[PDB]
Amino acid sequence: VLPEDRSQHLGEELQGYWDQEVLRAEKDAREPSLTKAIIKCYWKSYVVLGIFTLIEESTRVVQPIILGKIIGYFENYDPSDSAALYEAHGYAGVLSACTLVLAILHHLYFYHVQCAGMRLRVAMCHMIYRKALRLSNSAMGKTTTGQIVNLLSNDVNKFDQVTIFLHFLWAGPLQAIVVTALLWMEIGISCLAGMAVLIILLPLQSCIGKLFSSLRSKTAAFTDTRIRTMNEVITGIRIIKMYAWEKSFADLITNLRRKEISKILRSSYLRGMNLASFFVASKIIVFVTFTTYVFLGNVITASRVFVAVSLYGAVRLTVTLFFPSAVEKVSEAFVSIRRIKNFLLLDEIMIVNVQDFTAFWDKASDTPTLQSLSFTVRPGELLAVVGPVGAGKSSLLSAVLGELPPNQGQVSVHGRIAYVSQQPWVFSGTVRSNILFGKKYEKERYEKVIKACALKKDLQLLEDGDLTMIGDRGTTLSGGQKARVNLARAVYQDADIYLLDDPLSAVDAEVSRHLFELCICQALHEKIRILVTHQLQYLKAASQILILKDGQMVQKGVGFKAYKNYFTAGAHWFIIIFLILVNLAAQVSYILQDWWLSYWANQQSALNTEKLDLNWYLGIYSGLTASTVLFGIVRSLLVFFVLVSSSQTLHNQMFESILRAPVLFFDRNPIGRILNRFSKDIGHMDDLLPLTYLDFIQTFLQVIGVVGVAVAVIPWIAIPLVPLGIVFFVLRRYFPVFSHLSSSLQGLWTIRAYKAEQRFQELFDSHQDLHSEAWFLFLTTSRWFAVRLDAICAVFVIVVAFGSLILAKTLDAGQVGLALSYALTLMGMFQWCVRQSAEVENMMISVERVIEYTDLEKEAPWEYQKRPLPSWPHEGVIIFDNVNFSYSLDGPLVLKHLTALIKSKEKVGIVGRTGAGKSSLIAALFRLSEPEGKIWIDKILTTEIGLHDLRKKMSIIPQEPVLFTGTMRKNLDPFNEHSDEELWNALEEVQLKEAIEDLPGKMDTELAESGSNFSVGQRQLVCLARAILRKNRILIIDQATANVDPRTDELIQKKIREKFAHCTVLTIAHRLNTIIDSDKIMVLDSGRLKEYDEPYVLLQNRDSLFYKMVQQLGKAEAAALTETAKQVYFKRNYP
């Protein structure tokens, strides 16, 4: 691609014009206008293209007048007049030349208009992503990932369209008055009856633009919420599967898709009426006129009638097709412009020192989120930030980071920030790539980071080392691995100010102090550090400590199978056969109406007072017209019905297939690869493909009509038609960005912290330039074929023109008028037919990409033919018998020979280093991959019942808390199976009631994207609230309180003891104080169960792993734990 067409030279041009308009609007006291910016940018390039229009359009309108001179040779033909035949060969010559001129002008126009659109689309995409990197937290509340995907996927694709047709808004009306002027000299006042139709149709067609834009806007809304819901399914699929919530999301998507389709059906009918107009309007017009002509007392004769029909034919495209499509495309596009505009207008964002600082995350809040803060920290000092869940600790880092601006007071910072976010940010690549983050590789400093971040061991267990591939969100890594990678990245950048948001809570006690001592103290020793932490064990190493409570400071110290499927998915084969019949019936009645004028002309020519019975000729002419109109309407609406019904059916199968795909599918496919189907491809199948099919079907049958008429009038045309057909056969025989966007929006504060924004912009522009080469290669190959197909068509028009004059002794004037009027329409229709063919064939790739996702590999059936009795589980015994587990068949085993019994009502702790396989045990139990060996739950094999039979009966609290966009009520109870008093009881028991009663909607409060209103500790408490509302014998807890402070933890621990007393409970926990009272503790290393015994019995073996683990916490910690273990063990031995 030339530099002038690159995504970063584009985009920067239009951003300049946008900024100028924004700057002028404030001087004008206006609101800015994006249309205006577009115009100012492009106009000089685009208005010139109208020259092509003007030349072509003028050349079309003279051809009928030349046709009148040759028809007027057959009419009153004298075979003596060799001089007249020589002149007639002259006029056929000029038609041959005009045909070639029109052919080159069509390609020159259509190429450039396409390019124009591509430019506009590419420039817009750049500006949208540039804006996304600048959005404030306020703006990120007013928009969502699904909207931005929608913007970049479907809204900007309107820009491809606009540029095509836009010159026809004046060429249409202009042609309509020119043809009328012309017609006046052929048929007199009678032509006025034709203008009487156009002065109706064209204003009606234009005035309908308000419908298109209102329908579009309405549609657009539902696409945003649908794509957003797909995004939170695809990123939430593990938690959705473990909860068995698939049916709730299916109902929600189905209703949004139903609302959305109701507007697509409306619009499609409008669209369909336009293409019916293209077919029938000309027939209406010539009927109206010639009825008037015969009522005023003229008689039908070949030269006047067929020049008039040909005149209409010369305008037909421009007026009847191109003009309405223009209004359509433009009124549709102004919505895209308004959508984009609104986006573009959204809000945009050595020492550390803070003074008098007060700030609000939302100005509607009654209370500040930080109040009267002052502190300062300087090189070599470590400041610990301590306090409850929701106290403001991450808010403090966001104040230093500049993401929460002061309402009063001030902040000043000098030096580069390194930000270690509370949720780890990990993106697709190798784990080496995630650590380097654009810095050069240098072995000595890199290996020092790998050991300092406690990461050397894990990388030696992996087969491909630090070059192992990682998924779009790190879903292939355990929690404490994605934490260590997130910290190792920060160390490698060698920044000046480190902002550490609870980096240690996802790792084991040994790895925790390894990171603190070797990374946070020793490696970063010379640097400013602010450490948000609950690990009170380390605070003695801090230079100063800040305690926050309640927001304030407390203290400081294409195959045919695809085509077959696409049509047959829409309707039963009877409707498809009927649809074929009305297509043929429309085109046959179309031809017979024009043959009837040819026949009427010949009868009038045969007469001598004698006159034709007008009741017969005008009667039959009326019938054939009404027949053509009737089938034209039915044919146009029925195609839209079948193909939208096909898109609706193929979507449902694709979505059902996705919900039954195994989690391995989502680990191996990028999120953007999936959203591309549901956003872009479904968009084309709904909006654009049905229209383009009907347009091709109409024009293709019209082309066949020309060849049929030409051969039927002049049989010897069949001789050259064989070579032309052979050449036609010879030619035919010879002839992701959304994952990057999603990653960028997740990492946005960290990307801004390191000032990586330019490098991220360059990646986006590089990706757009790749798609641009694919677009230019498609255009270049399509043009190469099109310019040769036109050479076949041009020869056909030439041999029918001259063949008429060679064979003239066999012809009659009405017959030549018929054959050549059709021939003159051929090439303009033939060109558009070939264009719409190429776009259909291109868009069928979208259909294949959708069909392949209808046929994904399936996770096992949700209900088998065998089902457990409703009493099951009735004891909650779980037996693991020689279990082995791997997340893929081609991959390593992560659990080996695992063999254990869990008794009824037993409480079991699960313990061991990061990456040991602890959460892998839950994935086996839930059959997220199918285990080897055997697992028995109350004497039923988990593998002999359906995936909802077991998953519904096991409560889970996952390692990652996921909340969904919606009400707080729906996040607790999506099925509406509980009363509000039960939800409030849950919210009291998880210490969260006051935090919800402060919200203005209370439980009807709408949560932001991914639950962003809440701190991470609060999102953990909501997952415990979900699990309290379910009622099951078996509960699984995975690190459910790791981000919850100790004084909140001891309360929810007490409630867990009280509420789940009758359950069998499995608890994975690094925070050993939460599990020291277990009945038995499993200790895992390297995927093996090494110890499984009573807590005190483990600790009295000084060579055990568990004795080492409690001892690593420190002497007072080990004393408290060993005492607690001894006490519970003695109490178990007293009875």
Ligand SMILES: CCCCCCCCCCCCCCCCCCCC(=O)O[C@H](COC(=O)CCCCCCCCCCCCCC)COP(=O)(O)OCCN
């Ligand atoms: C013998 C035939 C004689 C008549 C031929 C002309 C037909 C029009 C006659 C005027 C009376 C009929 C109604 C006119 C429109 C009324 C206002 C509603 C417009 C509307 O709903 O649709 C518009 C679509 O474009 C349009 O509707 C565009 C219509 C353009 C008409 C001709 C303009 C000539 C100049 C073109 C210059 C092009 C230069 C290109 C380089 C804009 O949609 P919206 O309102 O929803 O959008 C913003 C949403 N927020």
Ligand SMILES: Nc1ncnc2c1ncn2[C@@H]1O[C@H](COP(=O)(O)OP(=O)(O)OP(=O)(O)O)[C@@H](O)[C@H]1O
């Ligand atoms: N992006 C946000 N938008 C609006 N409110 C927020 C946002 N993030 C946090 N809050 C609110 O600000 C207050 C403090 O949240 P904050 O995240 O600072 O708590 P925290 O100290 O990080 O708790 P944790 O220990 O779980 O990290 C809470 O009331 C929380 O609901």
Ligand SMILES: Nc1ncnc2c1ncn2[C@@H]1O[C@H](COP(=O)(O)OP(=O)(O)OP(=O)(O)O)[C@@H](O)[C@H]1O
């Ligand atoms: N989706 C996955 N696909 C393939 N392998 C995975 C996947 N998730 C985790 N692993 C591998 O599984 C092993 C164990 O991961 P697991 O989550 O069971 O460790 P863990 O005990 O939960 O560590 P943590 O204390 O951080 O929770 C890891 O070493 C990792 O290599």
Ligand SMILES: [Mg+2]
């Ligand atoms: Mg926090």
Ligand SMILES: [Mg+2]
């Ligand atoms: Mg885990």
